[PDB]
Every structure is written in C-alpha cells, then in structure tokens.
Design a protein around this ligand. Structure first.
Ligand SMILES: *C(=N)[C@H](CCS(C)(=O)=O)NC(=O)[C@H](CC1CC1)NC(=O)c1cc2c(OC)cccc2[nH]1
Ligand SMILES: *C(=N)[C@H](CCS(C)(=O)=O)NC(=O)[C@H](CC1CC1)NC(=O)c1cc2c(OC)cccc2[nH]1
Lengths: 301, 301
C-alpha cells in the first residue's frame, strides 16, 4: 500500500539524450535511430529570438554549424530539416540504445514523466500532467530545453512532450515531437500568458479513491448525486466537467472500494462547498488533480 | 524555475535489477559485478516466516536451489552467503551494466529515490525520505521486496535502502545494502510498531530557505536563538533537534540568502509557537519536510 507521485523508469529515454550546440546556444536533443530531435530555437542568436524567421535562419545554416555530442563522442551531422518547432539532425550513426517508440500527442488531464536534462545529461525525473490550459507545472532550469516527456507501455516509449519555454507565471510550455505547441504559445522571446486553468475533476476523483484504498475516509458521506447536478457544482468551482466516459474509466476503482462513482462525486461536492476544515488527504492540504485513474489503478492494484 | 519532488534518473539502477527465486518465492535482487544482493527471507517457506532460523535454513540450501534471472535469462549461482538480513549470491557473469557504486547507510531525514520493481522488472520511480522513526512512507505492492533506494552523485550510485516489509500502519521498513535494518525491525512475519514519528527540522529549514530564495520571506523576524534553546523548543512541538551536521549542510543556503542558520531557526520557532495566521509559504499552508538542503540546492541553482 501507499501512494506516491511516481514516474516511469527513465533508462530507455536516458540512452537517447544528447547535447546539441549551435553557436553559443546549447540544449538537449533526442537521438532515435539516426536522427536527433531538438528545439529549433537552438539556431537563434539572442537578437533572432525576438522575432525569428525560422525558415530563413535555417537555410543559412550548414551541417557543420551543429555540434552533437553523445557522451564523450561527437556525432557527425549529415543532414538537417525542420518540422514545425522541432529541428531534425540526421547523423551518420544509429543509436544502439533506441527503444521501441512512438510519437503521440497527449490530451489535457493526461500525465507523463519528464526527464529533465542539462547539456545532454539526465538530471532528474518527475511526473507531470498536461493542464487544461496546455501548460505543465514542471521543474526546469536554464539549458533544459529539449528535455522530453513520455509514457512507457510494455516496452514501447511514447514521447509526448519536448520542453521549449517558461511563462512569466513560472509554468512551462512545449511541443509534441512533431513540433506542434500544446496551447497558444509561440517560440519567440516574449512574455506569454496562458488561458485560465481549471481543475481536472476525473483525476481528483481518482485520487479520492486512492485515499480510500489507503485508509483515508473522513471525507465520505452517505449521499449520492446525479452526474448533471455534480457537473453544475463542479463548473461553478472551475472544475472540468465529468463525462460518462470518465465515470466508466473510474469503474475499476469504484469496484475495488465499493463506492459508486456518483457517491464519490457527492463527497467531492461537499469538499468543494465546505473545504477541508484543516484536515488533509494523503498528506495533502489541497485536492490533488495530477493522478489519472490509470495511474491510481497501476499503483493500488 | 518550479519546485518539485524529483527522483534521480533510474537507468543506472534499472540495469542492475534481477529476480531471485527460491522454491515458489520470487523477489528482486541487485546485480553488481558478479554478486546479487536480495532479502534473505527469499529462502523461507510461509511456515518458516513466523520464527525463522535463517542460519539453519541457509545451511540446508545449496547453490543450485537459487534461480537468478535477468529477464528470462538465468545467471548460474556459484556461491552464497548471508550478511545480516541480506543474501549474497555469487553468479558466473559480471554485470556489464554495473555503475560506479557505493553502499551507504543514510540518516533520518535524508531523501532517496526508490525504483519499485516486480519480478526483477522496474515499474516506477519515486522520491521519499527516511523518517525519524526509521520508516519510509513508500508505495509498494506484493512482490516488491528487494526494490532499492539510492542517490546518484556524479556518475556514482549510492545504494542506501533495500525494501523488506510493510508495517501495520502502511509505512515501510528495510535495510541498508549490508543487511542492517533501519530501526528496530526484524525480518519475521510479526506485527511491528514504529516509534512515534517527528518532523524533520533540517528539511523544514531547507524549505524555508527555498522560499526566501524565491522571494517569499514574510516569516523572517528580527530575532536569533542558540542552537540548544531551539532544540529544546523544537522537541516540544514534535520536531527533531538539529545536529552540528544539520547546521553544516544548511551553510550553502545560509550563504546564498545571507540569513544565518540560527536566525532562520528563530523564524521557524516563531512559526511553531504562533502558527501561520492564515498565511502560506510557497503556496502551502503546511511546512514541507521531505526536501533536504541538497534537494533545494539542486532545484534552486
Ligand atoms: C530552454 N532552454 C529555455 C527554457 C529554460 S527554463 C526557464 O524553462 O528552465 N527556453 C527559453 O529560454 C525560451 C526560448 C524562446 C524560443 C522560445 N524563452 C522563454 O522561455 C521565455 C522568454 C521570456 C520573456 O521574454 C521577454 C519574458 C517572460 C518570460 C519568458 N520566457
Ligand atoms: C516483500 N515482497 C513483502 C513486502 C511487500 S509490501 C506489503 O511492502 O508491498 N514483505 C513481506 O511481506 C514481509 C516479510 C517478512 C520478512 C519481513 N512481511 C511483512 O511485510 C509483514 C508481516 C506482517 C504481519 O504478520 C503477521 C502483520 C502485520 C503486518 C505485517 N507486515
């Protein structure tokens, strides 16, 4: 038993991290087979960054302007191209540590592991959720761009995030591995705001089940609610709507605990309307929304 | 920026995880050079577990009663011995993925990453701390014994924990890699109680320094204290007393902020005496105690 924020083991991804240098800019890249993926703003000077015309800037580069380092070994760049905000450097060497992998675009509310990397060297791993406003609350320092987020399923790594940006509020923005930003962000050097964020309701409910499985039950009550009446209250509090698909994916946790999904919704509605009254759930003073139902099932079954 | 519970990248440890089976019992082992380390209760039947005579049980075992597997690949066992609560199996293959490593015995308050493994297969990685009562608030399911906790310092893995048991309250107990339990626990199938837990004072102070570094400093006051007066008050609030080593490891944070250690102690003491008065620190109403001063230095520099 027990419940922790848990990331996927990172070794399959660690074997793919390299360092990419262009000019005086150094960031991380992802080496799969014979291609290195990295943020295209590596080609920018600080002047370019303000309003970069990326196609022009890239045409002016040669293969030799890119220095790729895997460990102590320089990889020779024999081609380059651009897919949206991601630069692809073809190298003359295939990565022997390439795992089975896919590039996927995740949905808001879904979680993934982030391998934070500096100068091509992995430094830490932690778990994140894509927020409804398409930011992530990460932990990143200068030189972290090109760090990736991923999930692992059997032996296949699904890469879903590459890091590009920190907003003035301190949350983070990035792209999928096809180079498309999550959210309304652009890779230029400007202060950018996100839309108003909301709370991931199906995740809060999954975490309330995790708390029950681990013996926290002070927040339960004898009541049930309708799904529509629950959603009226949830929206009032800036929570995302709960769909019937969400009710279904919570099925295994309802089964395990014997607590119907709409019974647990009546508890969540009482917590929104009354607060926690100085108490905690799983050691948290706040309702936690970055565990999906699958995360909880994986950990508690 | 951003401030998160972060685990170390787990690849170096993943390359060392194997499974060890004796009879029908399978747990995890750690394969370093040509030795596999694992919990000695793998040799027990359920009848043995209530009051095992490990010396006598081991004398009756031979090398050929132990099945060690890397994946489905058997490693032949060619010697065996017991060191306290850890079994050491010498195998005929030196692990080519052995990292530089050390075995260390950590102090209460120190944090580490846990790689949760089942049948020798890594499932997840998370960060936790050793509590003052020598338990960890981990996350483990059946078959997790032998999972290890570790820190990584440059390219060197310091192994500090091997998982052995879950107490009735749902917290976890285990050994260092020399087989010595943290705390007064024994590897038999009995209900064992941990001492009343306390708050890790050096870690709370590290987190207050993190708050100051980030501009959240309303709690700083114009007082100081002696170390002994602070320790005496700390104990009255179920906080651990500070050691000289705690004062030393807070030094870099003291220097960076300009706030003397004992001045920060006086600030914490006022917080404990008076409460938060409806204010928060780093967005939280609760004082965090599972970030060490090293963790803060890593994420705030
Ligand atoms: C990547 N290595 C780096 C992020 C580092 S972090 C702070 O997330 O650890 N990316 C950047 O520095 C981007 C580069 C731009 C092409 C996207 N820039 C920003 O993240 C950035 C710029 C600004 C500005 O510019 C005026 C104002 C406020 C915030 C901000 N963030
Ligand atoms: C190892 N794979 C397993 C821990 C799995 S967990 C629950 O942490 O995910 N270890 C055990 O089951 C140990 C084996 C003993 C040599 C140590 N036993 C316990 O953890 C254990 C036994 C008991 C009893 O026994 C009556 C009562 C209450 C709690 C308890 N815990």
């Amino acid at each position: 038993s027990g419940f922790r924020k848990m990331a996927f083991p990172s070794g399959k991804v660690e074997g793919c991290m390299v360092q990419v240098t262009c000019g005086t800019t150094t960031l991380n890249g992802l080496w799969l087979d014979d291609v290195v993926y990295c943020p295209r703003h590596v080609i920018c000077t600080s002047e370019d960054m303000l309003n970069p015309n990326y196609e022009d800037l890239l045409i002016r580069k040669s293969n030799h302007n890119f220095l790729v380092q895997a460990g102590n070994v320089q990889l020779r760049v024999i081609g380059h191209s651009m897919q949206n905000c991601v630069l692809k450097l073809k190298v003359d060497t295939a990565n022997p540590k390439t795992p089975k992998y896919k590039f996927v675009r995740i949905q808001p509310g879904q979680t993934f592991s982030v391998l934070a990397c500096y100068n091509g060297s992995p430094s830490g791993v932690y778990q994140c959720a894509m927020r409804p406003n398409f930011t992530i609350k990460g932990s990143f320092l200068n030189g972290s761009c090109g760090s990736v987020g991923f999930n692992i399923d059997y032996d296949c790594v699904s890469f879903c995030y590459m890091h590009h940006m920190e907003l003035p509020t301190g949350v983070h923005a990035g792209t999928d591995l096809e180079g498309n930003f999550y959210g309304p962000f652009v890779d230029r050097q400007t202060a950018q705001a996100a839309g108003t964020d909301t709370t991931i309701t199906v995740n809060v409910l999954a975490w309330l089940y995790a708390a029950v499985i681990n013996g926290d039950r002070w927040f339960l009550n004898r009541f049930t609610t309708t799904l529509n009446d629950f959603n009226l209250v949830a929206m009032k509090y800036n929570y995302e709507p709960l769909t019937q698909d969400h009710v279904d994916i919570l099925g295994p946790l309802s089964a395990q605990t014997g607590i119907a999904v709409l019974d647990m919704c009546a508890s969540l509605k009482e917590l929104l309307q009354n607060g926690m009254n100085g108490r905690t759930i799983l050691g948290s003073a706040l309702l936690e929304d970055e565990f999906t139902p699958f995360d909880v099932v994986r950990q508690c079954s």
